[PDB]
Amino acid sequence: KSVQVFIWLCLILVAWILLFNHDVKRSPAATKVLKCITRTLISILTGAFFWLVKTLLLKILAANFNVNNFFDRIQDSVFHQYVLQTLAWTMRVLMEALAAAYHVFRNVAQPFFNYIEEEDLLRFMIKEEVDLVFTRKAFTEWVVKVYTSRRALAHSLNDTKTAVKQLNKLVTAILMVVTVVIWLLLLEVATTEVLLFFSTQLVALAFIIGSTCKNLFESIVFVFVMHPYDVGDRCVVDGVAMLVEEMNLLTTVFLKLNNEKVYYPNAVLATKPISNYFRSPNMGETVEFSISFSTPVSKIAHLKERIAEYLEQNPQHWAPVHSVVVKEIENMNKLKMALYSDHTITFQENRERNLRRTELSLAIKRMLEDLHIDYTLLPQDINLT
Amino acid sequence: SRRALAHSLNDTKTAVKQLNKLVTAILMVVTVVIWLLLLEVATTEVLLFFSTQLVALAFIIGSTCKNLFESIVFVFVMHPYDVGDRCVVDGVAMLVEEMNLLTTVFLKLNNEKVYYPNAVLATKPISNYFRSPNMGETVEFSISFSTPV
Amino acid sequence: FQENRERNLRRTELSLAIKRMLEDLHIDYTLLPQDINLT
């Protein structure tokens, strides 16, 4: 549409120029109005070119956001469509897009059949498709997680669209003011002195509002170019974790672990480190405990073997890889000990991570209790009088 | 090691490609404006209005391409580290993941992704484990003052 | 230090060796004696 209107306007301008290109001076009054009209056509042509470049910038930004998120958005949409069947166009579909779902899934599954019914999937989709898509409780949990992910993707898309719309409004206002001033200058109504007075007032005001649109530009380049995080991702700033809520050009709203709303200046974040749990791979875990310096090495080996067995017998929560490291020796009476292991998920699920850490700590406590590992304070010698 | 070298080469190629795109856009805008000026279509007053708008916008986007230039001179000229090398910043170790013109992605010991502004790193010390020689070790323990020599 | 896991394991092994060697040598640490006057 933009190129069509641009060609329309340019053809109109050239046609007008050709008609009056001939040197036919109807009257001195006609010349002034003709010059004013031509200046108006040139000014509106410049405005149309500005609009074209503006929409080009907006479209390239939208395409960058698409390459960033629309792939996962379309994947989630396809997964949801496949699940529903078992039980651009992609951008439009994404924009358009618990107990009840679990009940529906259970009803679809054959009675007294915990595993997914192959016949039901086959009748609704091909066997290969069903296998690729693939415990009633596990299926319900997966459906709930997929729905939550789709909702988060929709919220992220809406936030990005709102930010792009606000940026479009701002740049359109800038274009409007630029084109009106361009038309005024072309019309040549103001004399010299007033023009330089306007110029000096303009450089003054330019410094004034530059002191702020510098921060604005930093914020937009931060949110767009670096793109450290998306909506709904858990991030840590200054050592405190929080969840992204709203993406604005000048600010970003975050929710702390205590459901406390926080407002941040986007410009400041550009000068601070940002960590993302959602984008990070499976995260590690650390536990701390201490034992006596007199503990035999055999007990330490037994504890290591028990830890390895416990970790390998629970793959769903902890990966087989693990390590036990001695930190430091305190007066050769206390031996600092720590265990390192990796979850099967990231820190995004804070509640699940905390529960798993508590379970691991309880397991370590029990295992230490059975092994009879004891810690004793340094003996004190007392001389009576 | 071969996989790490391939990843480093790919990251360097991607950074060079992005820099090429940026400089090519700058060249394109420069040449179009040069052609427009040579054609001599605009009159005087509009030319100085364009000039003042240009110096204004130049300050605006300079406030940021200054940091951009600092980041590129940091990643290229100093070249403190490569992809896959373990580095320590502010006393915390991490692993290089992605090399971007404006930022560098690092992974902490807990497999925690971190994003840094490349401009800031230029003003902070950087230590590289991969490029360093064999490292030392220290252990701490205490004994009684009455221990015989 | 690039191999953080290997470095940590080697440090732990060295610490255990130091612990054992100190244990065999019978090196002991004692807190400063405290004098108590009853009433």
Author numbering:
A (entry chain A): 248 to 334, 387 to 396, 432 to 468, 481 to 731
B (entry chain B): 495 to 643
C (entry chain B): 693 to 731
What did the authors write?
Amongst the Arabidopsis MSL channels, MSL10 is enigmatic in that it has two separable functional modalities, regulated cell death signaling conferred by its N-terminal soluble ‘death’ domain and force-activated ion channel activity imparted by its C-terminal portion. When heterologously expressed in Xenopus oocytes, MSL10 is indeed activated by membrane stretch and displays a preference for anions. In Arabidopsis, MSL10 is primarily expressed in the shoot apex, root tips, and vascular tissues, playing a critical role in adaptation to hypo-osmotic shock and induction of programmed cell death. Analogous to DmMSL10/FLYC1, each subunit of the heptameric AtMSL10 channel is composed of a transmembrane domain (TMD) with six membrane-spanning helices (TM1-TM6) and a characteristic C-terminal cytoplasmic domain (CTD) shared by all MscS homologs.
